[PDB]
Ligand binder design. Structure first.
Ligand SMILES: [Zn+2]
Ligand SMILES: [Zn+2]
Length: 69
């Protein structure tokens, strides 16, 4: 069908899925975690269920870090 790529500077914060190792295209309801990383909403919503630790940073995020309601 179609493909896309990247354009910008990216150090180590917001680039591609790393929980699953895939991509994050804009337009979907993705999620950002405060552990300087973002992944598919489902991916975080599973990695915090079956696990409890930042995929890259490996510090236990414990959840409830950012405000929720
Ligand atoms: Zn993912
Ligand atoms: Zn992180």
């Amino acid at each position: 069908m179609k493909q896309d790529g990247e354009e910008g500077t990216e150090e180590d914060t917001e680039e591609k899925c790393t929980i699953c190792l895939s991509i994050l295209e804009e337009g979907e309801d993705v999620r950002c975690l405060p552990c300087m990383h973002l992944f598919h909403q489902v991916c975080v919503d599973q990695w915090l269920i079956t696990n409890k630790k930042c995929p890259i940073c490996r510090v236990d995020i414990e959840a409830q870090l950012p405000s929720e309601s």
